[PDB]
Amino acid sequence: VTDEPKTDKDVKKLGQDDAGYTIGEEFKWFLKSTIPANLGDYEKFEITDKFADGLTYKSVGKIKIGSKTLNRDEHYTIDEPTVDNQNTLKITFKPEKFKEIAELLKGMTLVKNQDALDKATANTDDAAFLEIPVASTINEKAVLGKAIENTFELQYDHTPDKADNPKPSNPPRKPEVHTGGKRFVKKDSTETQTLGGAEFDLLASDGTAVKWTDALIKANTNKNYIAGEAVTGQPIKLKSHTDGTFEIKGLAYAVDANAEGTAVTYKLKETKAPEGYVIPDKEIEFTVSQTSYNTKPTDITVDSADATPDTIKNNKR
């Protein structure tokens, strides 16, 4: 047993490991490390997080030990993810500052056990650890219904021996996020033909409109499925293509559960019927689940778009 760093990563909030999001919706990952009282001796404390293709890094938030804040460019530096570094974040805690950071720990009770770290739901002076919030979104590269994991590696040098000899610490268990989709086909009442030109407002279960963002637009590039022009801040409106089909990609499901977790209901309000058909007076419910877009997301590295679409029927004038 040592006092050397144990690491863990959470998502959404401290103590949570699984969450579901709509593409473009910003949320926080939490990079977590125990801190030893002899931190002042350390010659390296560098965190590297290679974000999955399907994640877009936004920013690093307020870095905390217990109630105390660490300041950017005073206590640490950031190297942001880019195309050139393969989407990799590096956070370097300044060796010249290790004594000053160690002094901040005075009076604190430090978390020391891996399981205690994993279970931490707060970061306080009486149960303190290093907490790094990282703002992130799920992007268009996600596989719908698939767990998108994250982790990081700490390279730490605990020996004040004037020799560069770091060791790794890694989270034993990885948190994950997921997003989903749905496929549809518009038909007549007896399901004999497909119908183009039906238009639908996309709504949450509570009837509130789902709005476009730049990120959602990037995930739904097939203009055949979009009613009118899609621009950020405006309600999402979808359209059946001339083969009856349309889709929505990147809606949250299993909000507080794993990638196999509970489906979420959304609604379509039909606002335009295909030529010669009537507008219904009831909204259409559908669910987004692990398998509502891809039948086997755990097996694939790109969408297959093979789940059975929901049929939506129209009645003739």
Q: Which residues bind Ca ion (CB under 5 A)?
A: 8, 10, 17, 43, 157, 159, 161, 163, 165
Are 269 and 278 in contact by the 8 Å Cβ rule? The answer is no
Minimum CB distance to Ca ion, residue 21 (Å): 17
Minimum CB distance to Ca ion, residue 108 (Å): 21
Minimum CB distance to Ca ion, residue 161 (Å): 5
Nearest to 220 by CA among 142, 290, 272: 142
Contacts of 282 (CB under 8 A, 6+ apart): none
Closer Cβ to Ca ion, 114 or 304, answer by number: 114
Q: HEC string of 208-261?
A: CECECCHHHHHHCCCHHHECCCCCCCCECEEECCCCCEEEEEEECCCCCCCCCC
Closer Cβ to Ca ion, 18 or 270, answer by number: 18
Opening angle at CA 136, ends 131 and 137, nearest 5:
155
Closer Cβ to Ca ion, 157 or 199, answer by number: 157
Closer Cβ to Ca ion, 1 or 163, answer by number: 163
| 10 carries a ligand binding annotation | yes
If residue 101 lies in a helix (H) or strand (E), which one and from where to where? helix 98-104
Closer Cβ to Ca ion, 126 or 161, answer by number: 161
| 41 carries a ligand binding annotation | no
Q: How far apart are CA 195 and CA 188, in angstroms?
A: 7
Minimum CB distance to Ca ion, residue 47 (Å): 15
| 8 carries a ligand binding annotation | yes
| 116 carries a ligand binding annotation | no
Q: How far apart are CA 144 and CA 138, in angstroms?
A: 11
Known binding positions? 8-10, 17, 43, 157, 159, 161, 163, 165
Bind-site residues for Ca(2+): 8-10, 17, 43, 157, 159, 161, 163, 165
